[PDB]
Amino acid sequence: EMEKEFEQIDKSGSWAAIYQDIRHEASDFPCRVAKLPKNKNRNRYRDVSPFDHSRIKLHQEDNDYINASLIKMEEAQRSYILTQGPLPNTCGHFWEMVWEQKSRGVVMLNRVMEKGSLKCAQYWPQKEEKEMIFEDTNLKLTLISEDIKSYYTVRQLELENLTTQETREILHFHYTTWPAFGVPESPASFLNFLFKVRESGSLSPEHGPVVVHCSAGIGRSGTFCLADTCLLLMDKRKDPSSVDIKKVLLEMRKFRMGLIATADQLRFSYLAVIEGAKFIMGDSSVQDQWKELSHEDL
Amino acid sequence: KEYYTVK
């Protein structure tokens, strides 16, 4: 049982030991396109880049590079796109990707401002009446509604393809209380958020991969996808003891470097998968307790 | 900081 393994690591105290062990075992592939000089200004951080083999490609003829990776969990049967917080010049590429990849939801795990350091550009509209128009990529983006909550906000947006006039609804799930290099307040607030995303249908396979991003697209975004994927496998395999989080995290790291940034984020991942297993085991109604426990009203 | 692992 994975519950045992956790209590061992805690008493033993070897979380950073386990952590550093995974950095050591993580894959490492070429990143040539990311390192081209013409692409210097399309990366927020110089030590964070997509592998050539899983990088998302813009369907534009000029320059097809965006700092985003397709994480295709074959067994779990779910694909994610992890990406950096858009830069002032890459907002148009962000929504071009969202359109071309047919995504229906975007999960944003950081805030535009975080401890005085700008970690993301304001790439979605905040007022219904001031919609954004990205001319380089020919897209229009309109806020349609929002549902503010004590620690997260769900927005509904209309993404229009000016070239064809076609339009699509995009769900924006913004988690506003997750500090960089930090962890959510509780497994409950986290799982309540995850399951909100799940219930929206954004994670369904009729849709393109959900886009997940934070500042760099590896640390908080990593924690989110690990938890969802482990919960998926426990359900698909039919046994909670089956899943080896370390083996799952290493699988994800074949697709984008650096997923999960602190030893405490790794611990929260065990914690959250352990809690979420209650739901997978059949205890349908623990979900309503998570909503209650998270104080999503205020 | 331009570098993801900062001091």
Author numbering:
A (entry chain A): 2 to 299
B (entry chain D): 1034 to 1040
Copy text from the publication.
Protein Tyrosine Phosphatase 1B (PTP1B) is the prototypical protein tyrosine phosphatase and plays an essential role in the regulation of several kinase-driven signalling pathways. Here we identify PTP1B as an inhibitor of IL-6 and show that, in vitro, it can dephosphorylate all four members of the JAK family. Dephosphorylation of substrate is initiated by nucleophilic attack by the active-site cysteine (Cys215) to form a phosphoenzyme intermediate followed by hydrolysis of the cysteinyl-phosphate to release free phosphate. Asp181 acts as both a proton donor, enabling protonation of the tyrosyl leaving group, and as a proton acceptor, receiving a proton from the water molecule that hydrolyzes the phosphoenzyme intermediate.
To determine the substrate-bound form of the D181A/Q262A double mutant we used the bisphosphorylated activation loop sequence of all four members of the JAK family as substrate peptides. Incorporation of the D181A/Q262A mutations leads to a five order-of-magnitude reduction in catalytic activity compared to WT PTP1B20. Nevertheless, in multiple co-substrate structures of this mutant, we observed that both steps of the reaction had occurred; dephosphorylation of the pTyr, presumably via the usual cysteinyl phosphate intermediate, as well as hydrolysis of that cysteinyl-phosphate. Surprisingly, the products of the phosphatase reaction (both the phosphate and the tyrosyl-peptide) were clearly visible in the active site in all four structures. The phosphate was not present as a cysteinyl-phosphate intermediate nor as the pTyr substrate but rather as free phosphate. This suggests that dephosphorylation had occurred within the crystal, as well as subsequent hydrolysis of the phosphoenzyme intermediate, but that neither the phosphate nor the tyrosyl-peptide product had completely diffused out of the active site. Accommodating both of these species within the active site necessitates a reorientation of both the tyrosine (back and across, towards solvent) and the phosphate (towards Q266, where it has displaced the water molecule W1 that Q266 coordinates) compared to previous structures. The occupancy of the phosphate was refined as ~60% suggesting that a proportion of it had left the active site but that the majority still remained. Our structure suggests that incorporation of the D181A/Q262A mutations have corrupted the usual catalytic cycle in which substrate is released prior to hydrolysis of the cysteine phosphate. In some of the JAK activation loop structures with the D181A/Q262A double mutant the register of the peptide in the active site is possibly scrambled, with populations of both the first and second tyrosines being present in the active site.
